[model samples]
Target: STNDNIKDLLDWYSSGSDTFTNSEVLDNSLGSMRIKNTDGSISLIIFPSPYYSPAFTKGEKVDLNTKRTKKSQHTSEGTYIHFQISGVTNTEKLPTPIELPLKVKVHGKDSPLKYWPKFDKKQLAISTLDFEIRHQLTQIHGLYRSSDKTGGYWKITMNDGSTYQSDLSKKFEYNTEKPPINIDEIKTIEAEIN
Candidate 1:
């Protein structure tokens, strides 16, 4: 049952076609085996087991959900934290994998960018904002208050019809019931709502 329109084989070519094509398949009497092409010469060899495509030597880029990860960026009047997650796969059946940004522990406790100095104040404010967004899936908008009276805090609002507050030094906690008193003195903080 050969079909001519079947233009290619599964997992055969690495880059473009025809330059270097290789594959390994099972044999009848002996165990599995490998067949490879070098120069214009073909080689057949038996191995402990048939090798998979030679394209995977170091590692392979796998598809993953990366919405929670992004590169670092700077804005003139905004706060940000760049985050990424990377790890190796396991060989056996294990517990559910826990994927988290390494910067959380690399910097401090609970929240990743926990502490804040004068220059990095907005950084920590967004850090706490990011933590809330990732965890409870809420608090997508906020206002950063950097005044002596307000004492440097955040008032975050979610569509759940509630507000959360943080001191810009720790994680956010419940603040208000009315989501009230929108301000005009500061730049508004915002992230993708979902």
Candidate 2:
């Protein structure tokens, strides 16, 4: 028997759970494949959405218990029969697998579903996540916010590979009580996934 495609031999070329708005799943379905890092370590495939839904909840809103009911972990049903891939570590003493985030948690734009949606479910699925044993961090400025009664505070920032620093102007009166933070990294493992 022969595998027909040329790309089938490549690791990074493998297609994965990219559909973010799948309706049947309530959220999106998430899947991952094992990858051998160029450094010979194991990479953790993650959805890595900056949002809590995917990044925090690991992609799906359903679980393995039943097809019709929503469970906590999206493991069973038509989902991946195996929750994980290859041995976390290899014979060569590779790093532990990286946990990639997936996407989803769909419903509607208007009300009704809005009245009964899960916390941060709508805030999820905006981005995709992928990573290896160690994250490949890139630098950029993003708007960070906090919840406060008086409309809160905000600043632009990026990670020191995992954490963020806000190089913000104290011109916002709400920030007068505290000094602005300017950390260079956030120490997360991944960003910018397809």
Candidate 3:
């Protein structure tokens, strides 16, 4: 009876694990874990084989056929594997669960830092990147503002519609010459992405 019970538990846990398997793509196997992003996007980091680990950066997109192993340093025995998926935009609607096609090609591991660019301080002005939002910011169901002389804060809205303010004083120093502007004056705002 004990063996039967154990088998049932394992079956229940493994039911969803095979959802990503495709017969055509032998190299692309299902990952043991899944993650939902803030913008309602669902993605899986498939581990085709168990020889590699799942340590990845925020915006890294992984192929379904990649070999993955549990990182011994961070993972514990009998623990469900986990990975971090970042750069997801916040959205109002929850994402629908779906399995999408993924392609893979093997090449020599390129230097990850190849994309880094050098900037000239004289030609590049940081102020050009600065922008403002007109929408009211709320966090954890409460209105918030920066109290100290340094006046920069983040307003967050929770999933349950609660709002709260978070203090960013420690992370950023105030610029006396260019004080942060409030969005109260702007009636409408527009944003474009390329």
Leading candidate by lDDT: 1
Give lDDT tens digits, candidate 1, residues 121-161: 11122222334333322111211111111113334444445
- Residue-level lDDT of model 3, residues 1-194, one tens digit each, is 22443333223222221111111111222333354333333343433223332344344433221112233122345334333211111112213322211111112221121111221111111111121110111111111222211223434333454433323222111121121122122222222111
Quick one: best TM-score, which candidate?
Answer: 3
TM-scores of the candidates are: 0.16, 0.16, 0.17
Candidate 2: tens digits of C-alpha lDDT, residues 105-174: 1121111111111122211111111111101111111111111111111222234332322211111121
Candidate lDDT scores, in order, read: 0.25, 0.21, 0.24
Which is the winner by lDDT between candidate 1 and candidate 2? 1
Which parts of model 1 have CA positions greater than 4 angstroms off? 1-150, 169-194
Pairs with backbone N, CA or C atoms under 3 Å apart (clashes), candidate 1: none
Compared with the true structure, the alpha-carbon lDDT of candidate 1 equals 0.25
TM-score between candidate 2 and the true structure: 0.16
Better of 2 and 3 by TM-score: 3
